[PDB]
Amino acid sequence: MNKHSGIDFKQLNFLTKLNENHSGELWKGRWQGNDIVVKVLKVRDWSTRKSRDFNEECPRLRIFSHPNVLPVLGACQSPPAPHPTLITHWMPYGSLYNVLHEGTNFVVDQSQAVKFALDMARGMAFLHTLEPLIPRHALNSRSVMIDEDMTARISMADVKFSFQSPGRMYAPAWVAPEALQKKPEDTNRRSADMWSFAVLLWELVTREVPFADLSNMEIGMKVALEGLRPTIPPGISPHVSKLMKICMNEDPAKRPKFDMIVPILEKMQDK
Amino acid sequence: AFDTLFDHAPDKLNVVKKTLITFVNKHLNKLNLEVTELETQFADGVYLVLLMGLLEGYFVPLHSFFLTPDSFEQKVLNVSFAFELMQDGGLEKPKPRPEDIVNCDLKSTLRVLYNLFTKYRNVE
Ligand SMILES: C#Cc1cc(Nc2ncnc3cc(OCCOC)c(OCCOC)cc23)ccc1C
């Protein structure tokens, strides 16, 4: 018998569709007394091999041990489900991207932004203790969720699976230059994540989407081959400027570890 | 259907070739790349890969294909990969073999480009 049967697709109450795109569909729903989001994955040439791989890759995402990590609650195996499906808790404020760039009601203040930064750094430090690392986990403002008490949480549902096309990057503005060009096995993945955090810091400082005026293909080509970088903002504190520069070091080996920037961010807290 | 536009309206074939050059340049110019010659400039697969990312809104990591292909085999791999990206985007599996594009088969090239044009005319 299999160790996990996963979540029973029939037990999902689909309420309202939230989005549909290249990778599949996102629904708000209910399951066993939980308010959830359901990601229905669209996969070309689904196979028994890919289904087996999905079912081996999902259990790693069920991380319940850290406040700044949002677990996958479970997954529907396909077969018997119509499609491979992931379930997570519904996060009332949506993604960090939504809160920073699409917030029509209020603008989060910079004390809250620093708390978001600390939250993300703590969750990333925890994820970087895992052996092996969770593969194909890209950090950007769409893959961080904001919970009901404004806690930022790294979303484990936003990993890419082995059967999802490694050849299509949809958020290159947050990806380290070396990771635009080299296979993950040829990069230090933890160092690449720190670049992404540096871009998150830039986003929290400017309240702008990085390279918003350029297409994704433009961004990746210019960052990889032409040295395009975010411009350090004018008139910010020297301490913040210094932190952003060291996290965005051109040399991956000189970038700090997340567990070294956690105490730095702690000291920039109000409390 | 496309072969009537190819053969038995040679001034329309030139209109198709003029329309396709306009279209691919609207996107590739954003990378500081210019196409003047459909019969050769897509044969090594690079511009097809770059064009698909421009049309469907993603970057293609440079480890995923050969940006500067050094052999017939690498060009075939580039075109094959570009064909996969097209299918990822909703197009049916292209008719020509990837070798047909690398060999500068003029008909195979405009059929692939025109199907891109049919689908992505209005992409800005
Ligand atoms: C499984 C899974 C999975 C879930 C997500 N995304 C979310 N995860 C958790 N909670 C969310 C809450 C959202 O709305 C909050 C209301 O904000 C005002 C939300 O908005 C989507 C757009 O809605 C029009 C997305 C959420 C992404 C990727 C995967 C694979």
Side-chain angles (χ1 to χ4, degrees), chain A residues 44 168-169 180 182 216, chain B residues 57-59 62-63 84 88:
Chain A
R44 186 161 65 81
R168 298 185 276 118
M169 229 166 240
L180 296 171
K182 309 168 41 180
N216 281 336
Chain B
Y58 49 77
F59 169 69
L62 308 190
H63 58 75
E84 293 290 317
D88 286 353

Side-chain angles (χ1 to χ4, degrees), chain B residues 90-104:
Chain B
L91 281 169
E92 63 157 43
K93 177 198 181 93
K95 305 296 183 182
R97 270 162 326 130
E99 295 87 355
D100 292 342
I101 299 287
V102 184
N103 289 323
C104 304

